[PDB]
From a paper:
Here we report the cryo-EM structures of mouse [name] bound to trimeric Spike ectodomains of four different VOC: Beta, Omicron BA.1, Omicron BA.2.12.1 and Omicron BA.4/5. All of our structures show that mACE2/hACE2 bind the RBD of the Spike protein in the same manner at the binding interface of a RBD in the up-position.
The site of mutation is not within the RBD-[name] binding interface and, as expected, the binding affinities for both hACE2 and mACE2 binding to BA.2.12.1 are unchanged compared to BA.2. In the mACE2/BA.2.12.1 structure, the critical interactions made by Spike residues R498 and Y501 with mACE2 within patch 2 are conserved as in BA.1. The Spike protein from the more recent Omicron BA.2.12.1 and BA.4/5 variants, containing respectively 1 and 3 mutations in the RBD compared to BA.2, retain a strong affinity for mACE2. We further observe that Spike proteins from Omicron subvariants with significant antibody evasion abilities such as BA.2.12.1 and BA.4/5 still bind to mACE2 demonstrating that the [name]-[name]-2 virus can balance both evasion of the human humoral immune response and its ability to bind to different host species.
Author numbering:
A (entry chain A): 20 to 615
B (entry chain B): 333 to 525
């Protein structure tokens, strides 16, 4: 039997799971958009019910042999319900983990820093320090906010992270895994055929091979940026040194997109940042989401449902209730799709409308698969779909069709350099940070670093991999990595690394499918219905096939390939080479702000 | 003036369940099908065996109206020669069907905040139905060879499951009221039109 009893067992699991997992998402949505003391309780109760159901159904399914007597898709569904998730922890350990996670989330969300002159004037992270670190140019103003943020919440987050790591390492040990890092790296395992195979330990050697051909390109960008910043700050800059942490454009340094005004190549030519045109022409938050839907329809993808325009937030509700402004795309189930985002009229919030709507199109595509197979083919596939759309939406000629640039705008070499430098400030500038942070977390989880040497190894890897110096030294009490939202909310961060390679592979494949002749950084797949079915055939698969086969279906490869990325930045590599003819490429780790 | 009861099967306050559908036998009346277009928007009106034009020179001995409530993804299953959960365990149509179906969206009446659990369907029957058979029995379904005695677990399942309709689902998972008309020409001489 077995194979005939498995179909009836899954047909009973599915309709219970789809109903008991919908009212746990409708409670989280009602909490994230309202925030009170009742919605939190309802969310906790619904999550507890959904966890109890899953832990009951996962031990029952661990009695179905699976030697080799089944069909492929049933085997894939059964090999995904036999994981037990985090239910291996006992009641006490699970309660401790939930309490620690909730405390860290509340501390991070409610963290605030008060002005020294007026103790009654305090600013939060979102409408406060973010604007200072994104738009200010004063050394003292930028240093103060950074120091205050790293000294108020980061120092408080230290004690909880120890028990967090201990418990999540124990639960990974219980689940036949060496550590929790290997648990996070287990998303890259494929078993569907011969040749279409991969192992969760191969990830570290590939993620290192790929970060060898890229650093030569990043070094020239670092040299140019520091050359500009030296003119910006003659005093607190050393040419043979590393960049200060607070002078990076953000609170951490994730994206250097805010350094474009300081390091713009040619000021005379029209700007690529069309924020002012959007403000003047009279664009509201609804038009931003309507011009980002006409792009998906032209390429040949479905319209947004009618329950997306009436249920989504799309703008801060004002009124009196508190909301979380972190952009998110929600797939509540039973055909309910939503997007939560506090949209503003800026170019940065414009491209972001294409990233998050690219999650809804991907969710809308594999909604025909069984319940257990409704996920991205890989944790890095899901974030690489919005980015290829944002790449095409940002080209200097796509902004002329929608009217954001003058009809007599002239495109030439200067415009190409402007566009490429702006694009590289966001894409190249985030790769070393992502790789280093994930490497540090992987090394901590694997217990290769003592508890008394965390920050010293952190700020030592920064100035050998990334190249960012610290303004003031930190003791062992300081907890700097806990500042990031992803670190303190238990999220993987390696998705943003393989995302940046899958991005360019998919972009080149789609450009070739659209029959485009020319450079890669001017693709504009818009108005091409033959490059919207090549992607959709891949999006509508889910977990039903190995990620290697899904990648081969589109790009004709079975692994990461970094050659497509290098063609994108080819015109920028040369100009940076000649512009750095008489500059010392590289940074000095031995240098320090203090003597000796 | 003798009108025919087409508002007691089209304008009811609550319909039946899929597994316990209502059959009403219309006879001795003057059939005015034009009033069927009173709703106007119809999700489906495909008609089998006859023409939608309703040639006036058509007289039938009896009419049967079968009414129930399904999802929007299951309307295509109400047709001759289909398969699924509704056309195998709930409602089966013969391959020589004469008559046709009418479905329309009913989200403003059958959807409630918190869920509407008054509508049920059958799963796990162990055998396909025969045309126009109801089967409202409720007994524990066993899938293996271990006896089940009043206990629902592991390989023993309850055959009836609820829809739990809520607003804000989407066209696919949203309520749809379906009424199917079948026309019969019995061997007795026709006097009813
Ligand atoms: C946001 O949440 C608050 C608190 O839950 C809601 O205010 C109360 O909502 C309950 C039902 O959810 C009502 O019974 C009370 O009468 C409400 N109180 C007041 C003073 O109105 C509020 O409605 C929620 N906002 C929404 C749903 O938009
Ligand atoms: C159903 O009954 C209501 C109540 O009077 C009426 O307004 C509507 O026209 C009726 N619809 C029909 C008969 O199709």
């Amino acid at each position: 039997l077995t194979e005939e009893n498995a179909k009836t067992f899954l047909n009973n699991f599915n309709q219970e799971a789809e109903d008991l997992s919908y009212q746990s998402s409708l409670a989280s949505w009602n909490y994230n958009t309202n925030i009170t003391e009742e919605n939190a309780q309802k969310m906790s109760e619904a999550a507890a019910k959904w966890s109890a159901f899953y832990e009951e159904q996962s031990k029952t399914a661990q009695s179905f042999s699976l030697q080799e007597i089944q069909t492929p898709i049933i085997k894939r569904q059964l090999q995904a319900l036999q994981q037990s998730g985090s239910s291996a922890l006992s009641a006490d350990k699970n309660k401790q983990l939930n309490t620690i996670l909730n405390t860290m989330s509340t501390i991070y969300s409610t963290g605030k820093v008060c002005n020294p002159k007026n103790p009654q004037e305090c600013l939060l992270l979102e409408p406060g320090l973010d604007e200072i670190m994104a738009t200010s140019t004063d050394y003292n103003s930028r240093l103060w906010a950074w120091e205050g943020w790293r000294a108020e919440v980061g120092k408080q987050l230290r004690p909880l992270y120890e028990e967090y790591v201990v418990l999540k390492n124990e639960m990974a040990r219980a689940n036949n895994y060496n550590d929790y890092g290997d648990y996070w790296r287990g998303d890259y395992e494929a078993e569907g055929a011969d040749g279409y195979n991969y192992n969760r330990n191969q990830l570290i050697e590939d993620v290192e091979r790929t970060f060898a051909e890229i650093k030569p390109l990043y070094e020239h960008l670092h040299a140019y940026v520091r050359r500009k910043l030296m003119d910006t700050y003659p005093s607190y800059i050393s040419p043979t040194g590393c960049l200060p942490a607070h002078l990076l454009g953000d609170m951490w340094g994730r994206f250097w997109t805010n350094l474009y005004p300081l390091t713009v190549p040619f000021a005379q030519k029209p700007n690529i940042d069309v924020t002012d045109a959007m403000m003047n022409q009279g664009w509201d938050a609804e038009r931003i989401f309507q011009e980002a839907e006409k792009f998906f329809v032209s390429v040949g993808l479905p319209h947004m449902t009618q329950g997306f325009w009436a249920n989504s937030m799309l703008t801060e509700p004002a009124d009196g209730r508190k909301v979380v402004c972190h952009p998110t795309a929600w797939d509540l189930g039973h055909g309910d799709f939503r997007i939560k985002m506090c949209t503003k009229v800026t170019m940065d919030n414009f491209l972001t409308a294409h990233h998050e709507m690219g999650h809804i199109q991907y969710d809308m595509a594999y909604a025909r698969q069984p319940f257990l197979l409704r996920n991205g083919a890989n944790e890095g596939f899901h974030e690489a779909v919005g980015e290829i759309m944002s790449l095409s939406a940002a080209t200097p000629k796509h902004l002329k069709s929608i009217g954001l640039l003058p009809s007599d705008f002239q495109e030439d070499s200067e415009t190409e350099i402007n566009f490429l430098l702006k694009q590289a400030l966001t894409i190249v500038g985030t790769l070393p940070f992502t790789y280093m942070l994930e490497k540090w977390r992987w090394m901590v989880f694997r217990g290769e670093i003592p508890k008394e040497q965390w920050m010293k190894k952190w700020w030592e890897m920064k100035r050998e991999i990334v190249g960012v110096v610290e303004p003031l030294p930190h003791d062992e009490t300081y907890c700097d990595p806990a500042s990031l939202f992803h670190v303190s909310n238990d999220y993987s961060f390696i998705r943003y690394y393989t995302r940046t390679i899958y991005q360019f592979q998919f972009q080149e494949a789609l450009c070739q499918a659209a029959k485009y002749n020319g450079s890669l950084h001017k693709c504009d797949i818009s108005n091409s219905t033959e490059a919207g079915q090549k992607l959709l055939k891949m999006l509508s698969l889910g977990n039903s096939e190995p990620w290697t086969k899904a990648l081969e279906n589109v790009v004709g490869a079975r692994n990461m390939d970094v050659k497509p990325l290098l063609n994108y930045f080819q015109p920028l590599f040369d100009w940076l080479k000649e512009q750095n003819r008489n500059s010392f490429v590289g940074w000095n780790t031995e240098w320090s702000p203090y003597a000796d | 003036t003798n009108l025919c009861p087409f508002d007691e099967v089209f304008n009811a306050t609550r319909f039946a369940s899929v597994y316990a559908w209502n059959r009403k036998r219309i006879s001795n009346c003057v059939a005015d099908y034009s009033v069927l277009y009173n709703f106007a928007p119809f999700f489906a009106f495909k008609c089998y065996g006859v023409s939608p034009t309703k040639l006036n020179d058509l007289c039938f001995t009896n009419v049967y109206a079968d009414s129930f409530v399904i999802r929007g993804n299951e309307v295509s299953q109400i047709a001759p020669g289909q398969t699924g959960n509704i056309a195998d365990y709930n409602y089966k149509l013969p391959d020589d069907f004469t008559g046709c179906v009418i479905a329309w969206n009913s989200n403003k009446l059958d959807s409630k905040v918190g869920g509407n659990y008054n509508y049920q369907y059958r799963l796990f029957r162990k055998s396909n139905l025969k045309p126009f058979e109801r089967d409202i029995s409720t007994e524990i379904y066993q899938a293996g060879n271990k006896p089940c005695n009043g206990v629902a677990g592991f390989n023993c399942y309850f055959p009836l499951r609820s829809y739990g309709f809520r607003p804000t689902y989407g066209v696919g998972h949203q309520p749809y009221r379906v009424v199917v008309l079948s026309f019969e020409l019995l061997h007795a001489p026709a006097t009813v039109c």
